[PDB]
Amino acid sequence: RRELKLLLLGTGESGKSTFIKQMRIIHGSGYSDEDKRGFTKLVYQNIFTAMQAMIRAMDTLKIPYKYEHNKAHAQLVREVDVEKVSAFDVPDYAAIKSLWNDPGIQECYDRRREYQLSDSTKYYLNDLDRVADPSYLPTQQDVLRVCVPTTGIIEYPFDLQSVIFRMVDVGGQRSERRKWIHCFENVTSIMFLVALSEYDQVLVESDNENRMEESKALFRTIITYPWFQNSSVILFLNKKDLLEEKIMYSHLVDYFPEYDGPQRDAQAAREFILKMFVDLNPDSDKIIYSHFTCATDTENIRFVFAAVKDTILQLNLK
Amino acid sequence: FGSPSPEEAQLWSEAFDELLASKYGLAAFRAFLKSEFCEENIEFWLACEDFKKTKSPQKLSSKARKIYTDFIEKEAPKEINIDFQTKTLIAQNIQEATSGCFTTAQKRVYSLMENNSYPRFLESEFYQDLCK
Numbered sequence A: 001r002r003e004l005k006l007l008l009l010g011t012g013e014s015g016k017s018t019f020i021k022q023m024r025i026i027h028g029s030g031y032s033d034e035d036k037r038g039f040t041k042l043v044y045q046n047i048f049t050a051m052q053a054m055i056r057a058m059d060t061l062k063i064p065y066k067y068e069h070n071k072a073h074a075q076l077v078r079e080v081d082v083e084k085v086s087a088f089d090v091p092d093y094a095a096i097k098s099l100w101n102d103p104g105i106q107e108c109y110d111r112r113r114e115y116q117l118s119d120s121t122k123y124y125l126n127d128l129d130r131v132a133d134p135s136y137l138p139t140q141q142d143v144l145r146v147c148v149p150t151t152g153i154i155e156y157p158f159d160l161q162s163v164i165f166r167m168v169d170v171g172g173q174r175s176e177r178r179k180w181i182h183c184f185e186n187v188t189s190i191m192f193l194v195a196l197s198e199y200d201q202v203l204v205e206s207d208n209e210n211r212m213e214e215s216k217a218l219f220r221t222i223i224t225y226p227w228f229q230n231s232s233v234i235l236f237l238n239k240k241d242l243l244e245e246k247i248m249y250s251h252l253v254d255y256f257p258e259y260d261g262p263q264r265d266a267q268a269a270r271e272f273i274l275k276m277f278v279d280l281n282p283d284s285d286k287i288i289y290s291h292f293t294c295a296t297d298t299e300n301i302r303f304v305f306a307a308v309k310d311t312i313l314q315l316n317l318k
Numbered sequence B: 001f002g003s004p005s006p007e008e009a010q011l012w013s014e015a016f017d018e019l020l021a022s023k024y025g026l027a028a029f030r031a032f033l034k035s036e037f038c039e040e041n042i043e044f045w046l047a048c049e050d051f052k053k054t055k056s057p058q059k060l061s062s063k064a065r066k067i068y069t070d071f072i073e074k075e076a077p078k079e080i081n082i083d084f085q086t087k088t089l090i091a092q093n094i095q096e097a098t099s100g101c102f103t104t105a106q107k108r109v110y111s112l113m114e115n116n117s118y119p120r121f122l123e124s125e126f127y128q129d130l131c132k
């Protein structure tokens, strides 16, 4: 029992809990055929929430539904107790299906950068048939995609061959950052997640404040902490897949006018993103290890967390 | 006294309400949430469950303020993890607060425990020992 503690820090929804999920899959408790059943209800809740979100965006943005009966459908969806949902109704299936395929909702969906909408919305609504089946088992990939806010501070210990890594999931939101104090003692390494896809969104916690400008801000502060001078700092530029979608119509240059590189390139964009973060470092002797990740892909993570194992060992063993 | 039988405590697995029904079960779950620094969700929910039942438009307006400051106002001592939307939705409603002022946020916070802290309570050693 040689134990090393690791902090998963990052703003809201950078993909911290998803990482923990992937730990459990690669080196841990496993998600049994049964285990999976437990999530169903939340996948349902996610679906309803996302649609409830898009219906407000229709009001908010004054986007009209193409088919007028979709309003009374949206009315029905409006008024669902999302917690009391346990089964998936045929009327509610009809209502959502109908809405999702309304071109007004689709227009509203296109403009999700202008509002709060889970990144997993499309993944679920397109496989709504598969979900709505009365004998529905969620895949493991379904589970990773689920959006469940983390509140407070939770220790998730995993025994790798040589060592027991003690991982700590925290709340990404402003409200939770005052709590992070409670897990700062005795830290071998920070693992700071950043949603790459966040360069054009605004913050859930406040109106009209750029999400990436937040992360830079936070990263700098964390780095700056003196009780972290002997901790290894590993940066994860996450949601790289969502970046490959996003950069082909939302132009980084309009949010970060520094960017002298070309448009419509995932790579050249993200290399710039990385530079931005590395530059926030004051300490010249402190070297900042990084990675580009998609947290919802297990085969990808394994070549990172096998790699990051090797890094953290070499640092804080020999 | 106050102790629950193992059978009694096993029932708390059925659903989140079987736990909350239990006076002790509640005490244990709070203790748990303290251990992970998010007891503010359960206090707030409890705070709402009383407010909901408040009668006189005096208390219905001065409790309205008590809750807001404790949980909603930014940098509030017990600030709960919720959206600027919902928080503002409340802010405005508080001048002439009715029973259904926080009930939006109450529901989210419940779901936020239901789907998160509650499962973990169940996988805790304190609980599993209690089911013996």
Ligand SMILES: Nc1nc2c(ncn2[C@@H]2O[C@H](COP(=O)(O)OP(=O)(O)O)[C@@H](O)[C@H]2O)c(=O)[nH]1
Pocket (backbone or CB within 6 Å): A010, A011, A012, A013, A014, A015, A016, A017, A018, A019, A118, A119, A120, A144, A145, A146, A147, A148, A149, A150, A172, A238, A239, A240, A241, A242, A293, A294, A295, A296, A297
């Ligand atoms: N497409 C995609 N979705 C992701 C990725 N990482 C996380 N997500 C999703 O984005 C949401 C954020 O995950 P979560 O771990 O809850 O973020 P946290 O709040 O910081 O823990 C979840 O719905 C995840 O399924 C990614 O690399 N690609």
Ligand code: ALF
Pocket (backbone or CB within 6 Å): A010, A011, A012, A013, A014, A016, A017, A148, A149, A150, A151, A170, A171, A172, A173
């Ligand atoms: F925003 Al999080 F866990 F930090 F869902």
Ligand SMILES: [Cl-]
Pocket (backbone or CB within 6 Å): A072, A073
């Ligand atoms: Cl209908």
Ligand SMILES: [Cl-]
Pocket (backbone or CB within 6 Å): A094, A095
């Ligand atoms: Cl219908």
Ligand SMILES: [Co+2]
Pocket (backbone or CB within 6 Å): A069, A073
């Ligand atoms: Co109809």
Ligand SMILES: [Co+2]
Pocket (backbone or CB within 6 Å): A283, A284, A285, A286
């Ligand atoms: Co130095």
